């Protein structure tokens, strides 16, 4: 574990992370996709061998010795708010199991189901709170990666609020 497990946020490409493993915001079919998923495909294409996994699950595939955790959040275009919320919470619980199993001291994570899978709604708070519920019992250093300065400030404020 980390000596003093922490949460941090950075506004940059998760493909340039400084952590011991990465969470991909994957599609269920293991396809290159767009956004975080395409950057992850360009950086770690070997990790997409047999990466397909259902919604609400995470599947780890090694790129060399570097673990890529493919986490499949729901597409809120297709799910009800209620069922989507359940699957989004589940995806993060499976990420916490994988991070623990791998024995890493740090993980780079995106906010699942907040972009092309958001169904056109702001899900910063919803996605971040499910991330916290899952990861709070892990002792890895968590570094959250986002695209926009607005969200960088809101994620930073949410982390600082808990102290
Ligand atoms: O800002 C948003 N999402 C995070 C950034 C992001 C990343 C990748 N593709 C798209 C958007 C957002 C806010 C309100 C409604 C819909 C949104 F998608
Ligand atoms: Cl960047
Ligand atoms: Cl998304
Ligand atoms: Cl983001």
From Swiss-Prot:
Q: Specify which residues bind ADP-D-ribose according to the UniProt entry for this protein.
A: 13, 27, 35, 115-117
Instruction: Please spell out the taxonomic lineage of the organism that makes this protein.
Output: Viruses, Riboviria, Orthornavirae, Kitrinoviricota, Alsuviricetes
Q: How is it modified after translation?
A: Phosphorylated by host on serines and threonines.
* Function of the molecule: Seems to be essential for minus-strand RNAs and subgenomic 26S mRNAs synthesis. Displays mono-ADP-ribosylhydrolase activity. ADP-ribosylation is a post-translational modification that controls various processes of the host cell and the virus probably needs to revert it for optimal viral replication. Binds proteins of G3BP family and sequesters them into the viral RNA replication complexes thereby inhibiting the formation of host stress granules on viral mRNAs.
Listed under subunit, the entry gives: Interacts with mRNA-capping enzyme nsP1. Interacts (via C-terminus) with host G3BP1; this interaction inhibits the formation of host stress granules on viral mRNAs and the nsp3-G3BP1 complexes bind viral RNAs and probably orchestrate the assembly of viral replication complexes. Interacts (via C-terminus) with host G3BP2; this interaction inhibits the formation of host stress granules on viral mRNAs and the nsp3-G3BP2 complexes bind viral RNAs and probably orchestrate the assembly of viral replication complexes. Interacts (via C-terminus) with host NAP1L1.
Q: Which domain of life is it from?
A: Viruses
In terms of the parent sequence, the fragment covers: 1334 to 1493 of 2474
Q: Where is the Macro domain?
A: 4-163
Subcellular localization, per the record? Host cytoplasmic vesicle membrane
The entry's protein name is Non-structural protein 3
Q: Where are the transmembrane segments?
A: none
Domain topic, free-text comment: In the N-terminus, the macro domain displays a mono-ADP-ribosylhydrolase activity. The central part called, the alphavirus unique domain (AUD) has a zinc-binding function. The C-terminus region, also called hypervariable domain (HVD), is mainly disordered and binds several host proteins. This intrinsically disordered domain contains 2 SH3 domain-binding sites and 2 FGDF motifs necessary and sufficient for the formation of nsP3/G3BP complexes.
Membrane disposition = Peripheral membrane protein
Outcome of mutating residue 36 to E/F, per the record? Almost complete loss of mono-ADP-ribosylhydrolase activity
């Amino acid at each position: 574990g980390a000596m003093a497990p922490s949460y941090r946020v950075k506004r940059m490409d998760i493909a340039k992370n400084d952590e011991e493993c990465v969470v991909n915001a994957a599609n269920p079919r293991g396809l290159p996709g767009d956004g975080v998923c395409k950057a992850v495909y360009k950086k770690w294409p070997e990790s997409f061998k047999n990466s397909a996994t259902p919604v609400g699950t995470a599947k780890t595939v090694m790129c060399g010795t570097y673990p890529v955790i493919h986490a499949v959040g729901p597409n809120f275009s297709n799910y009800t708010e209620s069922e989507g919320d359940r699957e989004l919470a589940a995806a993060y619980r499976e990420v916490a199991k994988e991070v623990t199993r791998l024995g890493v001291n740090s993980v780079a994570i995106p906010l699942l189901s907040t972009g092309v899978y958001s169904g056109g709604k702001d899900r910063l708070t919803q996605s971040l709170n499910h991330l916290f519920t899952a990861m709070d019992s892990t002792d890895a250093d968590v570094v959250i990666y986002c695209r926009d300065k607005e969200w960088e400030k809101k994620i930073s404020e949410a982390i600082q609020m808990r102290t």
